[PDB]
């Protein structure tokens, strides 16, 4: 189907304590494959998926080198941003960066993005066309001008339309056995009697990949989407995902309620009947 490759960077300054923390991870779709921790012993880019082991020692040296240059630029950015916003050198702050690309079902480029945030608010981002910038407030307007004068946009277009897609296509092949699979949600349904006139109906979806899924409750064919308790999709820890959605019904009425599961591993949507 569609596929994506994304890199996430997290920089937390730790005043009085030493270097700021720097953590970076990379994902294909919903699978993480590399990590770097500025606190680990190794000080290396490390594998997190079995198929990224196929890459040679030239890969691991090159990525380790690139991640360190990324760390260094954030290390400088924490100071710069502190001055831009006129903040004391005592408070701790967070800088986050995300960037990557998407491809469609033909594995052709769909979109790229590069987003930058400071203390969890949008700071600066590359626009959809990959040629313009969105500046949040005054501090970003300076970084905007500075990055327009340096043609930083054009460096990114090169990566997001080219290098990114070249690599995502390379990883999707090396991980074909797992990245190009779909694990269909195993489903089931529980009935828990709460009151004397009420009961809790819960709809379960287990062991499914990718994480995208839809769980809805229906009554007489109608989405009951104000009376449902739907939990945020959660990792099961083995690569697959979990989700459940529950509703609280007047007893005697269970056969009016039906559960609806839409997943890309399901050829036809499911409908789990109470009967």
């Amino acid at each position: 189907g569609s596929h994506s490759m994304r890199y996430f960077f997290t920089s937390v300054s730790r005043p009085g304590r030493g270097e700021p923390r720097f953590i970076a991870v990379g994902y294909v779709d919903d699978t993480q494959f590399v990590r770097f921790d500025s606190d680990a012993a190794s000080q290396r880019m490390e594998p997190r998926a079995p198929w990224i082991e196929q890459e040679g020692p030239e890969y691991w040296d090159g990525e380790t080198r690139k991640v360190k240059a990324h760390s260094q630029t954030h290390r400088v950015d924490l100071g710069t941003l502190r001055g831009y916003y006129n903040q004391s050198e005592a408070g701790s702050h967070t800088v986050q960066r995300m960037y990557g690309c998407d491809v469609g079902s033909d594995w052709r480029f769909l979109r790229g993005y590069h987003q930058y945030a400071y203390d969890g608010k949008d700071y600066i981002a590359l626009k959809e066309d990959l040629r313009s910038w969105t500046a949040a407030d005054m501090a970003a307007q300076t970084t905007k001008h500075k990055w327009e004068a340096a043609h930083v946009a054009e460096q990114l277009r090169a990566y997001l339309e080219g290098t990114c897609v070249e690599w995502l296509r390379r990883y999707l092949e090396n991980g074909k056995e797992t990245l190009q699979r779909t694990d269909a949600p195993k489903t089931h349904m529980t009935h828990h009697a709460v009151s004397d006139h009420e009961a809790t109906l819960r709809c379960w979806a287990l062991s499914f990949y990718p994480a995208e899924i839809t769980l809805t409750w229906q009554r007489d064919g109608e989405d009951q989407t104000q009376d449902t308790e739907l939990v945020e999709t959660r990792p099961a820890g083995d690569g697959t995902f979990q989700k459940w959605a529950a509703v609280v019904v007047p007893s005697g009425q269970e056969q009016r309620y039906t559960c609806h599961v839409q997943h890309e591993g399901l050829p036809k949507p499911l409908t789990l009947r109470w009967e």
Partner: antibody
Amino acid sequence: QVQLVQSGAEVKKPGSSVKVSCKASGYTFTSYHIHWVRQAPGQGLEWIGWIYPGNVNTEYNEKFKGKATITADESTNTAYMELSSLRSEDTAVYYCAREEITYAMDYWGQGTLVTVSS
Amino acid sequence: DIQMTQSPSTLSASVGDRVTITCRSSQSIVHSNGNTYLEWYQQKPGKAPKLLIYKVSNRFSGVPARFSGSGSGTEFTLTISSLQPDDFATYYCFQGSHVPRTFGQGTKVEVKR
């Protein structure tokens, strides 16, 4: 240093089928679309379809759907175009070409001439 | 299908001449990406084609600088400045923004005498 090398010319009889080969080298075979294009003695160029090795996804020009089959063999770094239900209007030169992330056909094969006559 | 029509159909020029072939699409060739995928090809009789211009105005690796593309929407333009003897051939515009991808009918550039 990219190369697409195509099989030699052929001559067939109406109603039969032919299978042209296209051998790639010099790059990672399984990560770029390979297109097939035809040019009838007439004049213009016309697109047949494409294949992505690795997931073997194929998309055809509706003018040839039901007539062409495009396949690939990763083991040989080789693509195949098999045209069926041959008529005289299928005499042409048949080209395979690779596509670069920018959607453009950058490296072409030499061509294979195919002649359908009784 | 998207109709690609080039103008003119044949063209006779001398070395040093600046030549303009224009390519018109029956509809806009803009992808949901926000890119126009109009390419230009050069063909000599009997030979395989050569890529010249991709994404409307970008030169493919190793192509001379006197070739250039421009335009937007439904009109596209190849310009060959200060023509050279090797440049006498047939030129095709190509789209790829929509299915099916479709070529133009060609433009033959012949020698004038």
